[PDB]
Design a protein around this ligand. Sequence first.
Ligand SMILES: *[C@@H]1O[C@H](CO)[C@@H](O[C@@H]2O[C@H](CO)[C@@H](O)[C@H](O)[C@H]2NC(C)=O)[C@H](O)[C@H]1NC(C)=O
Ligand SMILES: *[C@@H]1O[C@H](CO)[C@@H](O[C@@H]2O[C@H](CO)[C@@H](O)[C@H](O)[C@H]2NC(C)=O)[C@H](O)[C@H]1NC(C)=O
Ligand SMILES: *[C@@H]1O[C@H](CO)[C@@H](O[C@@H]2O[C@H](CO)[C@@H](O)[C@H](O)[C@H]2NC(C)=O)[C@H](O)[C@H]1NC(C)=O
Ligand SMILES: *[C@@H]1O[C@H](CO)[C@@H](O[C@@H]2O[C@H](CO)[C@@H](O)[C@H](O)[C@H]2NC(C)=O)[C@H](O)[C@H]1NC(C)=O
Ligand SMILES: *[C@@H]1O[C@H](CO)[C@@H](O[C@@H]2O[C@H](CO)[C@@H](O)[C@H](O)[C@H]2NC(C)=O)[C@H](O)[C@H]1NC(C)=O
Ligand SMILES: *[C@@H]1O[C@H](CO)[C@@H](O[C@@H]2O[C@H](CO)[C@@H](O)[C@H](O)[C@H]2NC(C)=O)[C@H](O)[C@H]1NC(C)=O
Ligand SMILES: *[C@@H]1O[C@H](CO)[C@@H](O)[C@H](O)[C@H]1NC(C)=O
Ligand SMILES: *[C@@H]1O[C@H](CO)[C@@H](O)[C@H](O)[C@H]1NC(C)=O
Ligand SMILES: *[C@@H]1O[C@H](CO)[C@@H](O)[C@H](O)[C@H]1NC(C)=O
Ligand SMILES: *[C@@H]1O[C@H](CO)[C@@H](O)[C@H](O)[C@H]1NC(C)=O
Ligand SMILES: *[C@@H]1O[C@H](CO)[C@@H](O)[C@H](O)[C@H]1NC(C)=O
Ligand SMILES: *[C@@H]1O[C@H](CO)[C@@H](O)[C@H](O)[C@H]1NC(C)=O
Ligand SMILES: *[C@@H]1O[C@H](CO)[C@@H](O)[C@H](O)[C@H]1NC(C)=O
Ligand SMILES: [Ca+2]
Ligand SMILES: [Ca+2]
Ligand SMILES: [Ca+2]
Ligand SMILES: [Mg+2]
Ligand SMILES: [Mg+2]
Ligand SMILES: [Mg+2]
Ligand SMILES: [Mg+2]
Ligand SMILES: [Zn+2]
Ligand SMILES: [Zn+2]
Ligand SMILES: [Zn+2]
Ligand SMILES: [Zn+2]
Ligand SMILES: [Zn+2]
Lengths: 484, 484, 483, 129
Amino acid sequence: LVPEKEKDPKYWRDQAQETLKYALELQKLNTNVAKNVIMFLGDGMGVSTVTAARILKGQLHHNPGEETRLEMDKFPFVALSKTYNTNAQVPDSAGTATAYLCGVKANEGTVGVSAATERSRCNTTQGNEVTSILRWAKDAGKSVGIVTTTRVNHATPSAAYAHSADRDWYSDNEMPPEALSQGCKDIAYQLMHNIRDIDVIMGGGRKYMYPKNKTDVEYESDEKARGTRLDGLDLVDTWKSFKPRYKHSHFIWNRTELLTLDPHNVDYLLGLFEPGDMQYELNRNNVTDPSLSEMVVVAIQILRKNPKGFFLLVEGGRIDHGHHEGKAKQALHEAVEMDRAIGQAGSLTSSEDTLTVVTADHSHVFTFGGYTPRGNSIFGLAPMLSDTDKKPFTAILYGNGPGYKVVGGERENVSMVDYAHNNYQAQSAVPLRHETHGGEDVAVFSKGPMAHLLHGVHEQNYVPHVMAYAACIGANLGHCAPAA
Amino acid sequence: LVPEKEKDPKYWRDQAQETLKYALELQKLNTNVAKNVIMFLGDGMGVSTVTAARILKGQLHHNPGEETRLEMDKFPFVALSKTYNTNAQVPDSAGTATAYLCGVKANEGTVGVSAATERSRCNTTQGNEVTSILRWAKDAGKSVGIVTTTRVNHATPSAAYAHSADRDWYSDNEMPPEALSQGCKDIAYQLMHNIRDIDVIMGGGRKYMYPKNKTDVEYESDEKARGTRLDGLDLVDTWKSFKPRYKHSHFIWNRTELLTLDPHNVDYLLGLFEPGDMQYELNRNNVTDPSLSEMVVVAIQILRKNPKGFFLLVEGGRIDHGHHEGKAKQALHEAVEMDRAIGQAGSLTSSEDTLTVVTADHSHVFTFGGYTPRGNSIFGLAPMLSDTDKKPFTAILYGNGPGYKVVGGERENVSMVDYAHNNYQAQSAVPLRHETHGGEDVAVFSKGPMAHLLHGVHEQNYVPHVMAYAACIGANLGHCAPAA
Amino acid sequence: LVPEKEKDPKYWRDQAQETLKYALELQKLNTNVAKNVIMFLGDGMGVSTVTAARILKGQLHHNPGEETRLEMDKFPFVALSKTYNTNAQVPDSAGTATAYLCGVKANEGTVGVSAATERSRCNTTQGNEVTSILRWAKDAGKSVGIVTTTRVNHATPSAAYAHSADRDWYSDNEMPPEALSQGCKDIAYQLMHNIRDIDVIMGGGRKYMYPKNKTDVEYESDEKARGTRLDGLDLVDTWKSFKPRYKHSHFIWNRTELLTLDPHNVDYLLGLFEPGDMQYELNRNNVTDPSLSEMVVVAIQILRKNPKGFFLLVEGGRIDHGHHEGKAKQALHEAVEMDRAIGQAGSLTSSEDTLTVVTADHSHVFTFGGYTPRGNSIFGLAPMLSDTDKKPFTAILYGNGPGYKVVGGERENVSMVDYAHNNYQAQSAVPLRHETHGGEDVAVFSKGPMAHLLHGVHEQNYVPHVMAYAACIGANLGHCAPA
Amino acid sequence: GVSAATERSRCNTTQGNEVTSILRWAKDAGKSVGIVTTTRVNHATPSAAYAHSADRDWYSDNEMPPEALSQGCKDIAYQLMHNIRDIDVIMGGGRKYMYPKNKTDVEYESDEKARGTRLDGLDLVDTWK
Ligand SMILES: *[C@@H]1O[C@H](CO)[C@@H](O[C@@H]2O[C@H](CO)[C@@H](O)[C@H](O)[C@H]2NC(C)=O)[C@H](O)[C@H]1NC(C)=O
Ligand SMILES: *[C@@H]1O[C@H](CO)[C@@H](O[C@@H]2O[C@H](CO)[C@@H](O)[C@H](O)[C@H]2NC(C)=O)[C@H](O)[C@H]1NC(C)=O
Ligand SMILES: *[C@@H]1O[C@H](CO)[C@@H](O[C@@H]2O[C@H](CO)[C@@H](O)[C@H](O)[C@H]2NC(C)=O)[C@H](O)[C@H]1NC(C)=O
Ligand SMILES: *[C@@H]1O[C@H](CO)[C@@H](O[C@@H]2O[C@H](CO)[C@@H](O)[C@H](O)[C@H]2NC(C)=O)[C@H](O)[C@H]1NC(C)=O
Ligand SMILES: *[C@@H]1O[C@H](CO)[C@@H](O[C@@H]2O[C@H](CO)[C@@H](O)[C@H](O)[C@H]2NC(C)=O)[C@H](O)[C@H]1NC(C)=O
Ligand SMILES: *[C@@H]1O[C@H](CO)[C@@H](O[C@@H]2O[C@H](CO)[C@@H](O)[C@H](O)[C@H]2NC(C)=O)[C@H](O)[C@H]1NC(C)=O
Ligand SMILES: *[C@@H]1O[C@H](CO)[C@@H](O)[C@H](O)[C@H]1NC(C)=O
Ligand SMILES: *[C@@H]1O[C@H](CO)[C@@H](O)[C@H](O)[C@H]1NC(C)=O
Ligand SMILES: *[C@@H]1O[C@H](CO)[C@@H](O)[C@H](O)[C@H]1NC(C)=O
Ligand SMILES: *[C@@H]1O[C@H](CO)[C@@H](O)[C@H](O)[C@H]1NC(C)=O
Ligand SMILES: *[C@@H]1O[C@H](CO)[C@@H](O)[C@H](O)[C@H]1NC(C)=O
Ligand SMILES: *[C@@H]1O[C@H](CO)[C@@H](O)[C@H](O)[C@H]1NC(C)=O
Ligand SMILES: *[C@@H]1O[C@H](CO)[C@@H](O)[C@H](O)[C@H]1NC(C)=O
Ligand SMILES: [Ca+2]
Ligand SMILES: [Ca+2]
Ligand SMILES: [Ca+2]
Ligand SMILES: [Mg+2]
Ligand SMILES: [Mg+2]
Ligand SMILES: [Mg+2]
Ligand SMILES: [Mg+2]
Ligand SMILES: [Zn+2]
Ligand SMILES: [Zn+2]
Ligand SMILES: [Zn+2]
Ligand SMILES: [Zn+2]
Ligand SMILES: [Zn+2]
């Protein structure tokens, strides 16, 4: 396409020199204290997904896109995060979360607990618990919030509150007899009982909260949507019970109630907007379900009221799922939506006292190549046909996953399919049920007080140690001590 | 494997708080002036490549691998660089090196010219040349060196001294008639003539220097190692004839003469170690050819004589050819070999005066992931088998290229083959003759003075401006005016 | 030009539909309490002036410019403000200030008093004083700050603390002895003595604080910089004196001191960076003198301490000087600089508890136009030459001012002149020493709590009344009324 | 600090029956707060300003029966530093309940009976700063 302004060297020079001046002003560091702390987590947002979703974002504005700036791009400080679990080389959603929430690396498949546990053997839990930064914030006075698009007892959000030996123990319904009978209690149970004054909780998981076979508020006619608690416990009610009566506690289940609440009025909030995982944003109901930006806006309004500050984890957690499904147009629109939410937060707070980290737990085997010309749709085709099998190919290609498609001994001629569809699954090399995670590092975008402390190549479990220090919470208290 | 020390949460807590202590000390920025600037370019060294190579270095020491620190991993300041070309969303090795060496972004396939130059069109070069940091540093009075493992007129180093409308014009042999008509000389010519006192040149490409059909000094029988020049010019000899009279000038071609040189006592070196590209470090002749770290060290020793400092450019540029061949084992080893060069360079210069920026031009469609357990070999296999055709797969997989191996509509059973061999090509999604570049972002690593200025998610063309500012060369001399 | 995307109707429809989608969501009105209040005041930044300024900001980035968004362009709520003074159809710098700061229109020439007072007559200042929103806000226990690129006692910042029957009475040197004997105080004396705890005061006007003939600290070889107080008073030392017992006061005078500051250690700041008016942004000493954005940042960094909130007045006051001189490139660069400063104010505060308001006191007779093509430089020429005298002309043109040039009965052919130059005076219709104000309306831009209350075409006095209601300060404070 | 649902020395009946004191209400509204007594500062009377316990006897953990500690409740001295962490003025007695078991006293260095008591090993004076 070649924009006309970009053929002028003065353009590229002027631009780089402006960039330089800013980097010269960034030498005055922010050594304030983090009153508030916010962490964004694109589940599965590796470095390649960041780029592809920057392109996507701008392309939704009829710009070439590669020139575009994400909201996460504007963060002054970036670093790289080594993401392997003690258990495995190519890590998982949960043990990574124990790293970047609890400050301790752990075995795959285990939340809230250290490496001294094995997965699914349950007596190995006690004495091997590590508490998260969300627990550190609450014990410090702050308000704590969790916002996600996955089940609020899924792998990423659990390690903010739970301590399980298996990520799969959503309720007692999916536990084995042994773990139950050995005393262990489900993630959905631990959401309500480990920290009982979690100010904001928003996401999915309505069906893990209600007594078995109880109908759903949204879908009566759906059986798989029905309750699963073998406890017979109404955990929505167990929740309302654990909050004082002279404080306003609201439980909502749809968008309309969400955009109806008065934030200066409510004290505790539980929004459970689907039985399990929430909608893809391409798939959402503008009526019944809210967006992630909507959840995050209201969440910060409630949590802003605490004068001690607050801590808010936000999981753009459905990015992982679009990739696992091999449906990249889903993964990428999911990531753009978590960027819209990042934008919102920066508008509702101030760089001067709020430390914001955007990062990923791990990455996927999502690539895009093919020498595509400037501005070529990210879901478009590489510019000419294969050197080998003489058929065209997509710019996006996966390393493994369900896109593998050899229609009769040869690979699909994607010219008369719709690669531009929402549920198109780009080809991969190894067919599988699901696409796997990637071992490559992920970036760490930091803004606000003490953000520069996230530098270089670090281990993933360094991430919450930085934040805890900046907000004078947790184990190290030096950034507030007069001894510093 | 799950190492024992790593089961104690004290272990990780102690490590992060170690890392936290280091991070606080970096609050004392290094505001010195860059006496010397050394830039390590790894042709095609994507984020995923760096991580995979970090593991391999550690696995060559029989450590688990994932917990290793490459030499480049020890740089304090990491950033993400946006790689796209004005022309091409997925860029090439030429127009990116215009950007990270001249600070201007260009069209794919051109070097040292603005985007107002159209590829292969010679009459569009005049008036659109843009000079390089290597030029800016000669003009400030420094020693300038180029040390690559590709040809010394390959697209990457050629952007440092040349201004050419097609990466492909190696000699005048490879130039169309009307391009010679119109007047613009080949690259090999420009290497000798544009900047006629380059202090160190070293790498491949010897055949491009000698006139057509002239037996190579090393490969006397080989017919493709003969010179290519219709010029008739002996450019090794022209290189000698430009240099000042009472200064000692040397031209080497085998590894032995390199180490016999006494650096304290040579002023102008030219080492041409192969008729074309130097061979992969795995096929390196201990006898006839030096390694990157051997070329680098001898180079630095000749350059630190100049009291005004030196700019060195080092390209570990067979990383790109590695991935392009699908031979992940080649490219990873190149990457590690370039890391060894980074350590050598570090122990021959001081941080207090030497800004060392390490980055890449672009990435590749190289991924790894298979849920491989901790310590797994990087070239090894994924633990359990494909859900869709029950065959095994390698943890390393490509998005395209020559690893696509269907053996009858079924995809090759790799339990049958040596998936750990050097020239083994991991499988790909789309069969192409050559694996393609990836359009995602690449890391920048920086240590030494002003290194904290390479900080965010920035355009690729930003890099040489930081370097030129740090060093008080080129356009913005502001780091050296009276302004402390 | 004609960018490639703008040829496609989907582009313009997608664009509108997202502009509309945002417009809907803005229906959930922000009714919070303005903890902090920030007012940005572009002196002379009329409506024509901010269209040209938005071109300029984007043209700096090598864009065509017209599609660029300023920072204030991003505020949700726009209004038109009727600027007329009470004895002047085309208003002045000071009497408007009485309106948009004190909520009361007044006569041209007078700060901080009502329309009862006649100019240069002190014996009508007696008992005709109106207080400003700075006073009202301080009176409710907020920190308050003034940050300007004119003198800190110029016409516009003097409406926040002074009640002076003549905007010329900068110090007592400039006052007729007839008024000194009626017993009035110069604005500079009034700064330090009326509201004695203003937390930040930043700008020009240093020479009015030191005693007469006193050699100046920055430009000492020069006597138009020397002290002017006949009082013999040292109001920098007088300023340090009225501060509470255990509080840190500074007084800084150069840019190095401004960024050395630790805003966790400075309760009262005073910063006087030039003897008189500060240097145009395009002329400024990178080293001795701070930009407007630099001053706004550490001003907010200090005032963020106070837990009750703060009020801050920011005046980009040198746009008026730029137009008055006919030098559009200075006036437009001053406007862009204040925009930068408006962007900074957005990242250091949050729109949930901060109402910020961007406006101008009045406009100028600055126009621009001549069927220029798209992307044409704002300081460039119309495409065709005058069909009458066959000579080029500049897109930017003035109603009056020093721009008028006739070289021997002949209007100046301008291809022969550097009309892009930082001091070029684009041609006018009536020559004058200084170009004049405009009597047209000026926009208001408001973001944050109760910002939607600045809504239509209102009188100019109505502005601080909305700011005061929303921050629960001053005379009407039913927005906090436990109901 | 507990309602009438709690039962004395039955720890697991604390959660959900805490009631907060006027001292807490006052700090929550921004007032400075102080507690000056001549008894120990974790004695019955002042403790109701900050603590919520099921037995007044639980001055430090050294006095707590283990199943109380097992069920997680913290001793009153602990709660004095942790519950409201900005009590402006705390004056009175109870120095021994603030330091780890057997640290001699700053004032009576040769008293058996005056050594620290904390099995937490904690220095609650530093905890407090
Ligand atoms: C969102 O949830 C609210 C529940 O508060 C729904 O409103 C209720 O709808 C039922 C069905 O007619 C009424 O009997 C209730 O009186 C309503 N309550 C309130 C507070 O309005 C609402 O319909 C839901 N919206 C959607 C789209 O499902
Ligand atoms: C891949 O598919 C395309 C289209 O399905 C094939 O190309 C078309 O062949 C028909 C045959 O008459 C033409 O009418 C079309 O114009 C062709 N082009 C397109 C874009 O439709 C193509 O040959 C197929 N190639 C392989 C290797 O399968
Ligand atoms: C490395 O290069 C040197 C120089 O080209 C080689 O040495 C030459 O050997 C012949 C044999 O008679 C002599 O006549 C030349 O004069 C020698 N030159 C010099 C400079 O000594 C040497 O053989 C080469 N070694 C390898 C391993 O290739
Ligand atoms: C993939 O190849 C492997 C090895 O070539 C097959 O596995 C072996 O097959 C032989 C057949 O005689 C058995 O005796 C071995 O016990 C098998 N296992 C191993 C570990 O060697 C395997 O069946 C092939 N799978 C497919 C789907 O083709
Ligand atoms: C900015 O102001 C500071 C302080 O007003 C100046 O520092 C003075 O430096 C001289 C030496 O050059 C000392 O003798 C003085 O004692 C310092 N002043 C004070 C008040 O301590 C500084 O030189 C000024 N810088 C510029 C660029 O104008
Ligand atoms: C306005 O000035 C321009 C020059 O700045 C005049 O144009 C030149 O006129 C001479 C002869 O009169 C020609 O030789 C040149 O080629 C013209 N062009 C330039 C760029 O110099 C123009 O005629 C003047 N017009 C009026 C009405 O005064
Ligand atoms: C847990 O129970 C199992 C019974 O299968 C036993 O073998 C194991 O030793 C127990 N673990 C511990 C830590 O006691
Ligand atoms: C949401 O509203 C838009 C209005 O433009 C409509 O086109 C869209 O179909 C609605 N949502 C979905 C999921 O379709
Ligand atoms: C560049 O060369 C071509 C080759 O003949 C010529 O046709 C063309 O006109 C030249 N470019 C311009 C701008 O004239
Ligand atoms: C290089 O030399 C080492 C020992 O010096 C030898 O063991 C190795 O096999 C050689 N490698 C090649 C590729 O020639
Ligand atoms: C007060 O103002 C009047 C205006 O009519 C003037 O004549 C008179 O002299 C003033 N007062 C004094 C004491 O001069
Ligand atoms: C201000 O600094 C810049 C450095 O980039 C320089 O180019 C410019 O000329 C300087 N101008 C003044 C007036 O100091
Ligand atoms: C207290 O403990 C007893 C057994 O020690 C238990 O049965 C009872 O349920 C507990 N109380 C509560 C309120 O859970
Ligand atoms: Ca719903
Ligand atoms: Ca050789
Ligand atoms: Ca000055
Ligand atoms: Mg997840
Ligand atoms: Mg190369
Ligand atoms: Mg003014
Ligand atoms: Mg008592
Ligand atoms: Zn995940
Ligand atoms: Zn996952
Ligand atoms: Zn390359
Ligand atoms: Zn004015
Ligand atoms: Zn004016």
